[PDB]
Amino acid sequence: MRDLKTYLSVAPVLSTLWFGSLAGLLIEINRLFPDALTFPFF
């Protein structure tokens, strides 16, 4: 869709998409590996 990809390219729409994806990533990581205080995998 022309000019919708330009709107979704705009800084707030793109920032909310990036930070929603990133926050879901961090959230699911903390579900998978909750309560982390060390990196023991070396």
């Binding site: 990809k5 390219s9 705009v10 800084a11 793109l14 909750p34 309560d35 205080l37 060390t38 990196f39």
Partner: protein, 153 residues
């Protein structure tokens, strides 16, 4: 045993903190039916607490007189996992970001009005530039040696 701290698997105050939190959760678990959903969530939190304290036991965390895991960030190998192995894992990821957003800014630096790509991010160009920063440390190293890291005004 550095800095006068007993390990957390051996610290009596750490186990006392575990037992205190577990009793605090169990006193909230009595008010619900043993098969009900709040009770199951509380039990899941109880196992989460127990394995959290076990994992802080096994990962070499040191506990003080207050009985809380202290982080030895000096450089002792036994505790690199507390600060340095995460810290590098930060400086990588952080240096990914800055090496991406910098590179993007160099790729849209030669446009006519380069400010309308700051607010409207070229997703194809940004996606091409994002993984350039995967192995960013060698690019930053070489650009420091080639002088392309510092503008010459």
């Amino acid at each position: 045993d550095i800095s006068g701290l007993t390990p957390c698997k051996d610290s009596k105050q750490f186990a006392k903190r575990e037992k205190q939190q577990i009793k605090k959760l169990e006193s909230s678990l009595k008010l619900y039916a043993p098969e009900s959903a709040p009770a199951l969530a509380l039990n899941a939190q109880i196992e989460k607490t127990k394995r959290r304290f076990d994992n802080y036991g096994k990962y070499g965390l040191l506990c003080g007189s207050d009985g809380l895991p202290h982080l030895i960030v000096n450089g002792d190998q036994r505790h690199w996992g507390e600060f340095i192995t995460p810290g590098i894992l930060f400086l990588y990821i952080a240096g990914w970001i800055g090496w991406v957003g910098r590179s993007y800014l160099i790729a849209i630096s030669g446009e006519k009005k380069p400010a309308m790509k700051e607010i409207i991010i070229d997703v194809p160009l940004a996606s091409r530039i994002i993984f350039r920063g995967f192995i960013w440390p060698v690019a930053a190293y070489r650009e420091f040696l080639n002088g392309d890291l510092i503008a010459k005004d």
